Structures are given as structure tokens and as C-alpha cells.
Amino acid sequence: MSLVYMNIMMAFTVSLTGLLMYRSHLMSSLLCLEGMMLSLFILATLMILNSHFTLASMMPIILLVFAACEAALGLSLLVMVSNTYGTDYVQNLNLLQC
Amino acid sequence: PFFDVQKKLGVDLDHWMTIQSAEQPHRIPARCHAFEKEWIECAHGIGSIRAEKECKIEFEDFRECLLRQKTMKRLNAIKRQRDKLIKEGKYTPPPHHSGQEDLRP
Amino acid sequence: MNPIILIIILMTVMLGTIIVMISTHWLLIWIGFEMNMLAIIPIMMKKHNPRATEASTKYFLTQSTASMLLMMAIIINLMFSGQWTVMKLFNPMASMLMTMALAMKLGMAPFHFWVPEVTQGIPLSSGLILLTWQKLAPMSVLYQILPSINLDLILTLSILSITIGGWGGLNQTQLRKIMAYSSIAHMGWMTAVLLYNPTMTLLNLIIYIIMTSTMFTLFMANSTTTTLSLSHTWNKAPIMTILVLITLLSMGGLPPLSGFMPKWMIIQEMTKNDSIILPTLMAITALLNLYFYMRLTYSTALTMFPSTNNMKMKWQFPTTKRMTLLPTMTVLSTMLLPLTPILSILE
Amino acid sequence: MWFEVLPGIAVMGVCLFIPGMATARIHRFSNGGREKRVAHYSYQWYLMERDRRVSGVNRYYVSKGLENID
Amino acid sequence: MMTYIVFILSIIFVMGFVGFSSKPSPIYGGLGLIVSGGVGCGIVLNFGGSFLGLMVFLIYLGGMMVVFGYTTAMATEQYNKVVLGTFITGLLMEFLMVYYVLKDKEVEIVFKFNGMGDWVIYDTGDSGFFSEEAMGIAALYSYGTWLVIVTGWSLLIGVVVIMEITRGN
Amino acid sequence: MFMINVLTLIIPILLAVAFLTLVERKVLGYMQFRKGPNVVGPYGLLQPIADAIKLFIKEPLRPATSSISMFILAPILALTLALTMWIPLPMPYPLINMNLGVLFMLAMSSLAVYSILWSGWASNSKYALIGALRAVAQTISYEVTLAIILLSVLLMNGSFTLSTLIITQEQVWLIFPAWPLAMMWFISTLAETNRAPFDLTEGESGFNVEYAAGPFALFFMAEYANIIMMNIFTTTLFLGAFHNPYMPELYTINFTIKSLLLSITFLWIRASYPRFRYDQLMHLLWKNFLPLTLALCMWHVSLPILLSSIPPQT
Amino acid sequence: VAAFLKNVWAKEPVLVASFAIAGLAVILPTLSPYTKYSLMINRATPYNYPVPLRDDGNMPDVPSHPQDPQGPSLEWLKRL
Amino acid sequence: EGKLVNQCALEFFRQIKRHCAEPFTEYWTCIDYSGLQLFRRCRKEQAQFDKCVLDKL
Amino acid sequence: SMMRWNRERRRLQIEDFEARIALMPLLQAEKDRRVLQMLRENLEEEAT
Amino acid sequence: MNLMITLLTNFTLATLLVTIAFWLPQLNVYSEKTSPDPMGSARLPFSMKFFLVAITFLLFDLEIALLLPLPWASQTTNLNTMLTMALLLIFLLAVSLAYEWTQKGLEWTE
Ligand SMILES: CCCCCCCCCCCCCCCCCC(=O)OC[C@H](COP(=O)([O-])OCC[N+](C)(C)C)OC(=O)CCCCCCCCCCCCCCCCC
Ligand SMILES: CCCCCCCCCCCCCCCCCC(=O)OC[C@H](COP(=O)(O)OCCN)OC(=O)CCCCCCCCCCCCCCCCC
Ligand SMILES: CCCCCCCCCCCCCCCCCC(=O)OC[C@H](COP(=O)(O)OCCN)OC(=O)CCCCCCCCCCCCCCCCC
Ligand SMILES: CCCCCCCCCCCCCCCCCC(=O)OC[C@H](COP(=O)(O)OCCN)OC(=O)CCCCCCCCCCCCCCCCC
Ligand SMILES: CCCCCCCCCCCCCCCCCC(=O)OC[C@H](COP(=O)(O)OCCN)OC(=O)CCCCCCCCCCCCCCCCC
Ligand SMILES: CCCCCCCCCCCCCCCCCC(=O)OC[C@H](COP(=O)(O)OCCN)OC(=O)CCCCCCCCCCCCCCCCC
Ligand SMILES: CCCCCCCCCCC1=C(C)C(=O)C(OC)=C(OC)C1=O
Helix, strand or coil, X not given: CXXXXXXXXXXXXXXXXXXXXXXXXXXXHHHHHHHXXXXXXXXXXXXXXXXXXXXXHHHHHHHHHHHHHHHHHHHHHHHHHHHHHCCCEHHHCCHHHC | CCXXXXXXXXXXXXXXXXXXXXXXXXXXXXXXXXXXXXXXXXXXXCCHHHHHHHCHHHHHHHHHHHHCHHHHHHHXXXXXXXXXXXXXXXXXXXXXXXXXXXCCX | CCHHHHHHHHHHXXXXXXXXXXXXXXHHHHHHHHHHHHHHHHHHCCCCCHHHHHHHHHHHHHHHHHXXXXXXXXXXXXXXXXXXXXXXXXXXHHHHHHHHXXXXXXXXXXXXXXXXXXXXXXXXXXXXXXXXXXXXXHHHHHHHCCCCCCHHHHHHHHHHXXXXXXXXXXXXXXXXXXXXXXHHHHHHHHHHCCCCCHHHHHHHHHXXXXXXXXXXXXXXXXXXXXXXXHCCCCCCCHHHHHHHHHHHHHHCCCCCCCCHHHHHHHHHHHCCCCCXXXXXXXXXXXXXXXXXHHHHHHHHCCCCCCCCCCHHHHCCCCCCCCCCCHHHHHHHCCCCHHHHHHHXXXX | CHHHHHHHHHHHHXXXXXXXXXXXXXXXXXXXXXXXXXXXXXXXXXXXXXXXXXXXXXXXXXXXXXXXXX | CHHHHHHHHHHHHHHHHHHHHCCCCHHHHHHHHHHHHHHHHHHHHCCCCHHHHHHHHHHHHHHHHXXXXXXHHCCCCCCCHXXXXXXXXXXXXXXXXXXXXXXXXXXXXXXXXXXXXXXXXXXXXXXXXXXXXXXXXXXXXXXXXHHHHHHHHHHHHHHHHHHHHCCCC | CHHHHHHHHHHHHHHXXXXXXXXXXXXXXXXXXXXXXXXXXXXXXXXXXXXXHHHCCCCCCCCCCCCHHHHHHHHHHHHHHHHHCCCCCCCCCCCCCCCCHHHHHHHHHHCCHHHHHHHHHHCCCHHHHHHHHHHHHHHHHHHHXXXXXXXXXXXXXXXXXXXXXHHHCCCCCCCCCCHHHHHHHHHHHHHHCCXXXXXXXXXXXXXXXXXXXXXXXXXXXXXXXHHHHHHHHHHHHHCCCCCXXXXXXXXXXHHHHHHHHHHHHHHHHHCCCCCCCHHHHHHHHHHHXXXXXXXXXXXXXXHHHHCCCCCCCC | CCHHHHHHHHHCHHHHHHHHHHHHHHXXXXXXXCHHHHXXXXXXXXXXXXXXXXXXXXXXXXXXXXXXXXXXXXXXXXXX | CHHHHHHHHHHHHHHHHCXXXXXXXXXXXXXXXXXXXXXXXXXXXHHHHHHHHHXXX | CHHHHHHHHHHHHHHHHHXXXXXXXXXXXXXXXXXXXXXXXHHHHHHC | CHHHHHHHHHHHHHHHHHHHHHHCHHHCCCCCCCCCCCCCCCCCCCXXXXXXXXXXXXXXXXXXHHHCCHHHHCCCCCHHHXXXXXXXXXXXXXXXXXXXXXXXXXXXXX
């Protein structure tokens, strides 16, 4: 298939493996999650514009909006973590081992 | 559990965006409208198990419309053979493929 | 929380799951999962302590990752099929990604690592919602895509879930982690019979929801979250020890109880398809689940652990908690096996 | 008095007058003494590329009228 | 070379993701995701998605990454080898992808990909006096009733959810 | 030939921003019963030149930056966005005639808060970071009413095309059907550019105080380019002039006079009012402008339908 | 119903104007005689090509030419 | 049939060129000046062309 | 004023769209001959 | 294409002016300065209210993104449904603003 889809899928996998390998910050995790969403937006958009499927042109906007609301919720969770420990470090979130 | 509320109540919540061949605004067709209409009219009602083996031709034509893999493979082959023959000097492109022909209309 | 806001948020959780159940477009499937997650996050942060925020953060990260993999599976389906019907998928890569995403949502092993944490971090009512209501929407999507699910993947996820949920509960004393590893083992049992007979998948889901709702309702009515506080129940309410006895003996699947009903039916559908090793090893692995159920029954019903003196004060006060449907759920989770051919209503 | 501010306003107004006057004269210079063809929609671009093909000089704005037919 | 331009943007797009997926700091990672959003917007714009590309600017970049950078600047108090090694690893894997799919005009990582410029897959007609993508987004109010209801309800509930969980009571 | 057109756009932008500083000092002079600059040039016409040469040979302030890269990027982004807001402006013909020029300007103005945010974080001062967060929150707050007012006006236009907005106003100014939208729009553009009475970066530290005289002058000229641009955009949007297509300079003279009067109205508003407190302009947005803006957005949706006055798409 | 209204118009005229304009936007298109013409003008706008019909022989309402009498007319739009 | 279109258009324009070439030329020149090719800018040249065609054809 | 002028603008839009409609058969015939010209040239050069 | 040329020209002129403003007074040899804020060294205290106004911006910006195709959506032939859903979206933005009001979310930055 087309050549641009290779790069958009590879971008989704790069943002996947960034989201699946945390370093320290939860904000960097949320950025990798939104990179995954952005690559999904681009890939859906290039397909729907290519196929001239008219009714799905409203589809990526929807894919934006919900997920950005999702991002808002994630930011709020991070802030609550930051209001407990002072930092958004993922190693502070280890109390549920016992 | 596929509680088919939409067919039960007769409402149309999301069937309209489901396929490319549905009713579109301003009657805009998809690029693979005809192939998808033929694949759907083939595979309608007979179930998925029969639809995989009995409607393989329409589905392969529709997938090759969607992604154009055989078409781009053929264009790869023709362009590669043309570039090889240009490198060998055994071929020359015509004036209408070099941009010297004063286009049609 | 404002009770009106609690009602609207629980109706939004239910609305998300119902939108997953009734929709014919993959975008509305993804929207129902997003609405479900977005609305269930305040149910987990109901008490506002750092364990609830940690649990909600872990729950958000796992469900968000599964939602992104779900949308990538949907988008690859749109690549290779040019449409959006919630039916079989038209690519084994999209089928693998959707099976992984739904295994992450269900918390099936090896994507199980959030389930005993999050259930520990949240109250008993929100843990009840997470272990009963949050299974319904991904099992509906797995119900509708089973002509595309890889057999080796779904059975690998099933046996890995059953074994890890068996060994995980043996080391626990916290009741919520026991119910979470019980959840992982029972989801393994549900997905092991999915490609053979999904009516038995629905049967196992319904009997599991009844038994889990009974055990969480007993834990809420006795206000016990640990084994050793559940062992004070005989000196406070002796009927509740009988109820946790019969319900834990049901959840292990001992006949003549109704929790013997699903797994037996699952074996009844896996030997028709010439699989003998797999349901036998599954049934032998479920003895671990029954072992830590027996540990809880020895702590609670069949012995009497020592109590404290202040228990004598609680003797003067009856339970004012609304023990909603607890006799109904207790009867249904124990005495339903003579009505086993009722399962045809799920066909 | 107050008209002392008018030289700076005049300078600034000439500086705001320059871009539109410049783009109007450049559009009339680059497009045969006429406006630039506005092609917001693909039909307008189709007509414009047809004009470029029927002009014969690879310029869309060179218009051919009734003298180009017999 | 200019026939490959969207492909070229996509390469930069992948490079931008190796910017923030390697996670240098959430603020440089925010900057890398902003640059990635701009070039992915350019990819969208070069197929004819004008409105969707301006949604990438106005709503993803100007709407959401503003809030990411805003929240991030209220943490990570102002003033690696794993980041640099991860960045050069992702860059070398991407340039090996480029080298293979340009030397062969075909590659297969998971799916088979043609190596021609992505101009070849387009349509050779006109859409008349409308953008088809604009009319498909305009159909959200005429054909997308259930989609509008569930999206607006999810946004209202999202307002309620953020106000419940950020209160601590 | 197109590069000449780009230069004749963007060099007169810099000259008009240069002499807007003189016009501001003079007009604020006479409104304060004094004179403005009249010594340095004849009538003070050499004051911006002298001030530019002074600022570009002043000592670099040399800060310790938390990030060198974003400290460089924030003036670059500010000037690039302040120059790209001009290219779809139909005066009478835009440099870049695009179909979605209104949404393009709304997007490129939504990107302008990153210069404030990056310059605030790139400084080591925490109080400068607090001021940057307040300025960003102010700007993104008033962008909401920008977008909704702008949508409610373009419901009478038919498209996002800026050149169509001249055709829309051939019979009447669009300030007549939309003067409440015009007045909330005008105060929202006053609050976008951090302009008085909304200038809390000078109310008692600015986000860009760690920059040297050169780069702070670049921020300053990007701000005044935004001011002139938003006044031109408000002129195009509500006070659209007569356009003879055979004589485009009539439209150029007319929108130039109206945009000058609107920029002087910015100058005359800063000579008249005290500042808001920060919560008070938050109260102005969220509790006053936004309910009226939503109500008028409902009104301007339903009004072309109930009067059969839906504008054409093309 | 009248003292409360003068009270809220004395205290909060921004919100009274907001709810009043919103109420007019809700109720007034159902009371307008010109809402019908918005629909009629949007369906009179020919974005697509008028794909002609094969003359079977019995279609008395379909014209053979644009300047024929039968067919949909736009006298109401030119007159109003 | 397409050739018939391309045969019937030319007979359309020749019959303009035989009779009313100059009002048509002035009219499409005035149409041609506009970058959107407005009909509303050119109503008097349109009126002259319509008058000349209605009288002579 | 916006009522009268937008109704005039809708009538002018219909006049432009009917000019387009009257021109679409000629453009469709030319487009068909255009694309068949290009496909025949591609076929002949593929043959050689 | 002309847009990309114009963006490159604007970005290049901005980068040139920033380079001149950062390197023209570096040529002078003025003096070395030793040079040894309202908060001294206290860590930046987090404001919940700035985060809430930014999230309220984000959610209303998503609702605006839904509202943006209305000048195109008015051209439809299903105008009763279009008008109903347009009024419903603006009404749900108003209900979001009202709930943000009544639970004191718009307070001390009102
Ligand atoms: C574009 C060209 C220029 C446009 C015009 C602008 C020129 C004038 C500018 C003057 C300088 C302003 C400097 C900044 C001022 C900031 C302060 C300020 O004004 O705040 C806004 C003030 C705020 O008021 P406030 O805050 O003082 O009021 C107190 C409010 N409470 C009680 C909550 C504390 O007013 C508004 O918000 C109104 C905005 C415009 C409203 C327009 C309404 C039009 C009429 C609608 C219909 C009414 C009748 C009812 C329905 C009938 C139906 C038939
Ligand atoms: C194919 C199948 C399709 C779908 C079919 C239907 C599936 C139904 C799945 C049921 C899932 C139930 C989820 C949990 C209940 C949801 C509401 C809730 O949160 O209730 C708990 C509530 C909280 O009150 P609170 O005060 O917070 O309690 C803590 C102490 N202060 O109140 C309490 O704590 C009160 C204590 C008792 C609560 C008992 C609730 C039991 C609900 C489940 C009943 C059994 C399932 C229904 C029958 C079988 C259906 C398959
Ligand atoms: C779109 C339009 C934009 C227009 C922008 C500009 C607006 C303002 C225009 C200029 C206004 C008048 C300028 C007068 C400058 C001062 C001239 C003067 O008198 O300088 C005297 C000084 C010393 O003279 P000296 O001989 O020593 O005196 C003793 C005599 N017995 O001698 C000197 O200082 C030496 C000579 C210096 C001359 C400088 C002249 C001014 C430079 C202006 C630059 C811009 C010009 C216009 C650009 C756009 C049009 C091309
Ligand atoms: C090869 C030989 C040249 C070498 C390189 C030099 C390049 C040209 C530089 C400008 C001309 C050189 C002379 C500069 C001024 C010297 C004379 C002077 O200072 O005259 C004073 C006179 C006003 O007298 P004053 O002392 O102010 O008295 C107060 C009133 N009672 O002052 C005046 O009347 C006004 C003086 C104005 C100075 C010139 C105008 C400004 C500079 C314009 C060009 C550079 C900037 C271009 C634009 C930058 C961006 C805005
Ligand atoms: C920190 C990094 C540096 C920061 C400073 C510099 C970047 C920020 C300032 C510049 C922002 C660049 C914006 C580029 C796209 C703008 C949107 C756009 O193209 O809209 C115009 C137009 C849409 O209208 P329409 O008329 O429908 O389309 C033509 C159809 N006849 O569409 C067109 O005309 C399409 C023209 C062809 C496609 C253009 C693609 C541009 C290149 C890719 C994006 C470049 C910016 C990347 C970085 C963003 C910011 C980080
Ligand atoms: C039905 C049409 C659609 C309606 C929905 C769409 C409306 C568009 C505008 C959006 C407004 C969004 C925000 C609304 C919030 C309302 C609640 C509120 O503000 O309550 C508090 C307020 C007192 O203010 P306070 O809390 O003290 O704040 C400090 C300022 N003094 O309390 C008050 O000021 C009391 C406010 C309620 C009374 C307003 C009465 C207006 C009546 C106008 C005539 C009738 C119009 C028809 C609609 C019915 C209205 C009831
Ligand atoms: C490319 C550079 C062009 C010239 C520089 C901008 C025009 C001159 C503005 C001078 C100026 C004035 C009058 C000024 O008053 C001021 O202080 C508020 C500034 O900011 C530091 C200024 O920059």
C-alpha cells in the first residue's frame, strides 16, 4: 500500500513504545499517549480523504474531541498526584503493592 | 451481546456512517462506491462463513480499489523497466511524455 | 459527592456500556468505552485519599492505552475493509490489536497487573462496579468479533489468566485482591469457551456477576476489607458467615452449587470440539481458586477466630445498611444448578 | 496643537496603504491586466487548468475567444 | 523530490515522535509534539484536509498542547544518555526504513508498502463548488444526531468529572 | 514576483509598527494635556529610528536561562506568527487567498501563547513564570469568545473566506446586525493583545523581562503588529468598505482609514481607564461575555433560518 | 413573576439579556413564516448535475427542455 | 454522443460569431476581468448581448 | 438589510450554479476524451 | 506553495532579526559583570485555580470545535434537525458554564 501510511504507523508504534516504557514523569507518558492519538488522527484523516468517504470526515474531529477530553482527565489525575507528592514521578505511585 | 435496539425500535443511530455506499451529502460517491456496492450485494444475507468463500472476487476487487496494491505494483514494474531501458539507452520517451504536445482540450 | 451528580455519573457509566452494546459503528464502540472510562473515574475517587488517586491513575493509563490500541485496530479495519460495521475484522493485525485491547480492558493476563492494585485502591462499591459492570462492554465486543479472533491468542490469554489468577490469590489476605484474582481466573474461563460456544461465555459471565455481586454485597454489609476483619463476623452477625460460606463454596464451583454450573458447561462445550487436555488443566487449575476460597471459609464460617471486647457494643445496634438484593443474589448464586437448562435463554 | 500627531498618522497610514496597493498592482501585472483568478473550489481550478491548456502558451490568463474557433 | 513532499513531511513527523517518545523532559517533549503536530497538519493539508488541519492547529496545538505546556510549567521545577541513545536508535531505524523503501520501491515491516511517492493514489476529478470534506463535516448536524448527543453529553460529563475529582471533597 | 509581494507586505508591517510607537506617544501625550515627542525629529518623526538604534546597541542583559533553546524560540515564534496573521487579510486582495482564512487566523493566534509560556519558563524567575501563566490564562480565556463571536458573525458570511466578508457587507456594515458581537469582539481583541485595561504584565512582572533590549524590542514589535492586525481584521469583519474591482485603491484607502481610527481607539482606551484586577477580567469573560456570547450564538444560528437569510456557501 | 423579574433585571442585566436572547432563539423560528423559505431555498440550490430521466413515454410532469412549462419553478424566489 | 456535444457547441458559437461577435466579445471580456467571474458585475454587457441575441437569433 | 442581500446572494449563487450545470456536459465529454487519450498513450508506451 | 514560501520568508526574517538582536551587541567589549525576585528560593506553589481555568478552556475549546462547522451546516436540507442540534450544542456549552458557575469553579478568577 501507500508510502505515507508506513510512516504514520511507525509513528504510532514509536509513540506506543514511548508510552509503554516510562522513564520517570507521568507528563511524558501523557505526551506519548497524545502522540498516539495524533498519529491516529493523521492516519484516519489520510484514509478518509483518500477514499472520498464523505460522512467519515466528521470522524477524526470526534476522535480528537473525546480523546482531548481524555487528555484533560489525565492531566487532572496527574495534578492530584502532584498535589500529594510534589512531583509527578511514577515511582511515587507504588503504594498498592500492599 | 448485540442488543439490536436500532432495528428493534426502527431508529437509525449509526448505520449511516457505516459504509461508503450509503446516502452521502450532495450525492458524493466514494472512489470505491461501485466495488463496495457489489461486495455488499454479493455478501448480503448469506452469512459470513459463506461470504468469505463465495464473494472472494468482489471483495478482492474492492480491497484492490481501496489500497491499490496491485495497481501500484504494476506501476512500479513499468517505471522500473522504463528506467532500466533509459539507462541502457534502448528506449526514448515520446514528446507527449516529455511535455511537448500542447494538451488536449 | 452530590447524590444527583452520583446518579448522573452512574447513568453515564451505564450509558457508555449500553452504547457499546447497541451500536453498529466502531466509532460508537470507541465512544462508549471513552464515556465509560470518563464517567467511572469519579466513582473510584469517591473517598479522596492517595490510594484512590493512584488506583485511578493506573486505571486511566491502562484503559487509555487499550482505547488507543482499539482505535488503531478500528483504523486498520477501515484500511483493509473500507467500512465501519461492528462485525468480524478484515485483517489479522487488527484482530490481534483488538484482542489485546479488550484483554487490557478486561484485565486478562498478562495485562492483569492493574486489576489487584486498582481494586485495592478503591472502595467496595466501585470495586463491585469495576469487577461486574466493566466486564460487560468488552465481552460484548469479543462476542461480536469472534469470527476473527485468533484461537491461539485467545486460549493463551485464557490459560494465562486462569493460572495467574489462581496463583495470585493464594498469597493474599486483602479481600479486594482476592476478588480481583478471582476476576482474572474467571475471565480466563469466559474467554476459553468464546470461540466454541459464546452462550456459555454469557452463562459464565452472568453466574460470575451474580456471585461477585453477592460477595461484594456481603463485604459491604459487614464493612470488612481484610480476612481478619471478615473473621469477626460470627460474633457480629452469624448469618453472614453462612452466606459467605455457601457463596465461596459456590465460587469454587463445588456441586451441587450454581457456580459448578458454568465451568462444567464450559467443559461440556470444549470436549465436543476435541479439546480434552485444555479443560482438564483448566479444571485442575481452578482448585487453586477453590483453595483460597476454602481459606476464607476456614477463617470466617467453619472456625471462630478471637474477637475483641468492643464488639459487645456493636451487639446493641442492628445493621442499617441497605443490603440491596442480598437474599436474592445469595439464593441465585447457590441454588440455581437444578435450573441449569435455563441457559438456552442466552442463545 | 492636536494636528501635530497627524504626520505620524500619515506615515503609518501610507505604510498600511502600501501592501494592498502593491498586491493589487502585482496581481494585475501577473495576470494579464486583470484580477488573480480565485480558485477556492475544484471546479474553478478545473476551468483554470482548462484555460491554461486552451491558451497554448501555458498561461491560464491568456484568454481565447471566438477568434480561436472557425 | 517535490513529488515526495508529503512523504518527506511524514519522515519529519516520525522524527518528531522520536523527539518526545524518548522523553527528554516534558517541556522539550511538548515542543517535539508541537512540531510533530505542525508537520502532521501539513500532511493532512496536502491531501485536501484544510478544516482538519486547522483543527490540528486550533484544537490539538492551540487548544490542548497549550494546556499540556501550561500544566507542565506548573510542575517540573526549572533549572541524558538514555534519551540520546533512544533518539539515535529511532532515527537510525527510520533512516534504514527510508533507505530500504527507496532502494526497493517496496518494503514489508508488517504490511507491504509501495515506495513510490504518495501522489499516485489520488483522484483525477473535481468536487464541483464544494469541498467534500467540508460537507462531510457539515453533515454532523444533519446526519450526525446521535454522534452530537453522545459527544456533547461526554463533554458535559467531563466538565462534571473534572470538577468532582479536582476538589478533594 | 511573488517574493516582491511578500516583501511589500512585511516590510511595511515593520514600518507601520515603528511609527505606531510614535503615534501612541503623541496621542497619549495630547490626551494627557502634554505633547508627545517633537524634539528628536521634526514633529518627533525620528523618535522610532533613534529608539531602535538605541535598543540594538544596548548591552545584552545576559540572563541565566533554564532553556537556551526556548529562550531563542519565543521571539522567533512571536515574530513569525505576528507576520503570518497578515497573509490572508483581504485589503482588497489578500497575499494568500485561502478558503479558510478566518479559521487560519484563529489558529495562528491561538498558537501565540506559546511564546509567552516558553519565555516565562525559559526565565529562571518564578515570579516571571507566574506572570506568564496569568497572561496565558487570560489570552486563552478571551480566545473562547473570539472563536464563538467569530463563528456567530460568519453565520452571516456563508464561509470562512475572508474575501467573501467584503461581499457580505456591500449593502450595509456588519456592525449593524452584530454590534453586540462587535463590542464584545472589540474588548476581546483588546484583551488578546494584553492591551490596557487588560495589561497585567505592567500591573503591579512581565513574562519577557529577562530578554535583552533587542529581543524585548522584537516581542514589543510583534505585539504592535498583532494590534494593527486585529484592528484591520475587526475593520474587515464589521466595517467592510466599498470595493470597486476596477479601482482597488478605494478599498485600500477606506480600510486603511478605518483601521487607523480603530488603532487610535486602542490608544484612546489606554488613555482613559485604570486596569482590571486579574479576577475582575476573569469575571468579565466567564460570567459576562461568555453567557451573552453563547446567547447571541444561538440567536445568530436561528436568525438566518427564521428570516430566510442564509448566506450562500460560495 | 414580576417582582422577581424586575429584581433580576436590576441585579443581573447581563444574564437577563442572555436568557432572553436565548429564549427568542429557541421559540422564534417555530413562530416565523419565513422558516419555510429557508428550507425551500436550500433545496433550490443546485450543487449537483440534474441527471435526466429516460423518457419511457408516460411522464407528463417531467419537461423535455428547461424552458418548458412543467417542472419545478422559482417564481417564489424571484418575487418573495 | 460526446462528439455530438463537441459538434453542437461549435455550431452554437459560430452562430454567435456570425451575428453578435462584438457584444459577446465585450461581455465575456467584462466577465473575464473578475477573478471570480461574477455575473453581477456585468449586467449591462449582459443586457446588450441578450438584446442582440434575442433580436438577431 | 442582510435579509434582502443574502436572498439576492442566493439567487446569484443559483445563477452561477446553473452556468456550471449548462457547461458540465461539454466539460464531461472533454474530460472523457482527455483521460482516454492519456490511457491510450500509457498503453502504447507500455507496449513499446 | 506560495504559502510555504511566505511562511519560510516570515520565519527567516524572524530568525534573522532574532540573530541580529542576540548578536549585534555581543560585538561590544563592555565589562564583565559579577552580579551576585520576590520569592527568594522557595519552590513555586501550585495553584489549583490556574489549572482549573486551563482545563475549562480545554473543554470549552472542544465544544467550540464541535460548533465550528455551523456556517457550512446551515446549507443543509435537513434544517429542523440541524437547528435542533446547533441549539442543543450551544445549550450544552451553556449548561457546562452554569455547572462551572454553581459549584464555585469560577471563583477568585471569576
Ligand atoms: C468594533 C468597533 C467598536 C465596537 C464598540 C466598542 C466601543 C466602546 C468601547 C469603550 C471602552 C471599553 C473598555 C473596556 C470595558 C470593560 C468593562 C465593560 O464594559 O464590561 C462589560 C460589562 C460588564 O458589566 P459589569 O461587570 O459592570 O456589570 C456588573 C455585573 N455583575 C452584576 C455580574 C457583577 O457589560 C457587559 O458584559 C455587556 C457586554 C455587551 C452587551 C451588549 C448587549 C446588547 C443588547 C442585547 C439586548 C438587550 C435587551 C434584552 C432583550 C431584548 C430582545 C428584544
Ligand atoms: C447479558 C447480560 C446483560 C446485562 C444484564 C445486567 C447486568 C447487571 C450487572 C450488575 C452490576 C452491578 C454493579 C454495582 C451496582 C452499581 C451501583 C452502585 O454503586 O451500588 C453501590 C451503592 C453505593 O452506595 P455507598 O453508600 O457508596 O456504599 C458504600 C458504603 N457507604 O450501594 C450499596 O453499596 C448498597 C449495597 C448493596 C448493593 C448491591 C448491588 C447489586 C447489583 C447487582 C445485582 C446482581 C446482578 C443482576 C442480576 C443478574 C443479571 C445478569
Ligand atoms: C513610507 C514612508 C516612510 C518614511 C519614514 C521616515 C519618516 C521621517 C522622514 C525624515 C524627516 C526629516 C529628517 C531630517 C533629519 C535631520 C536633518 C538635519 O538637519 O540634520 C542635521 C545634522 C547636522 O547638520 P550640520 O550640517 O552639522 O548643521 C550645522 C549647519 N550650519 O546632519 C545630520 O544629522 C546628517 C544628515 C542626516 C539625515 C537623516 C535624514 C533622515 C533619515 C530618514 C530615513 C527614512 C527616509 C524615508 C524612507 C522611505 C522612503 C524612501
Ligand atoms: C561613509 C560616511 C557614513 C558612515 C556611516 C554613517 C551612516 C549614516 C548615519 C547617519 C548620519 C550620520 C550623522 C548622524 C548625526 C550627526 C549630527 C547630529 O547629531 O546632529 C544633531 C541634530 C539635532 O541636534 P541636537 O544635538 O539633537 O539638538 C537638540 C535640539 N536643540 O540631529 C538631527 O538633526 C537629526 C540627526 C538624525 C541622524 C540620522 C537619522 C537616523 C539614522 C538613519 C539611518 C540608520 C537607521 C535606519 C532605520 C533603522 C530602523 C528604524
Ligand atoms: C518551533 C518551530 C518553529 C515555529 C515558528 C514557525 C511555525 C509557526 C508559524 C507558521 C505556522 C505554519 C502553518 C502552516 C499551515 C497553515 C494552514 C493552511 O495551510 O491553511 C491555508 C490553506 C487552507 O485553505 P484552503 O484555501 O482551503 O486551501 C487551498 C485550497 N485552494 O491551505 C493551503 O494553502 C495549503 C498549502 C500547502 C500545504 C502547506 C503546508 C505547510 C508546511 C507544514 C507545516 C509547517 C509548520 C510546522 C511547524 C508548526 C509549529 C511548530
Ligand atoms: C430557555 C432558553 C435557553 C436557556 C439556556 C441558555 C442561556 C444562554 C446564556 C448562558 C448562561 C450560562 C450561565 C448561566 C448561569 C445561571 C446561574 C447563575 O448565574 O446564578 C447565580 C446568579 C447570582 O450571581 P452570583 O452567584 O451572586 O455571582 C456574582 C454576581 N452577582 O443568579 C442569577 O443571576 C439568577 C439567574 C437566573 C434568572 C435569569 C432570568 C432571566 C429571564 C429572562 C426572560 C425569560 C427568557 C426565557 C428563558 C427562561 C429563563 C428562566
Ligand atoms: C526590526 C526593528 C524595527 C524597529 C524596532 C521597533 C520600533 C521602535 C520601537 C521603540 C520602542 C518604544 C517607542 C517604546 O516606548 C518601548 O517601550 C515601551 C519599546 O519597547 C522596549 C520600544 O521598542
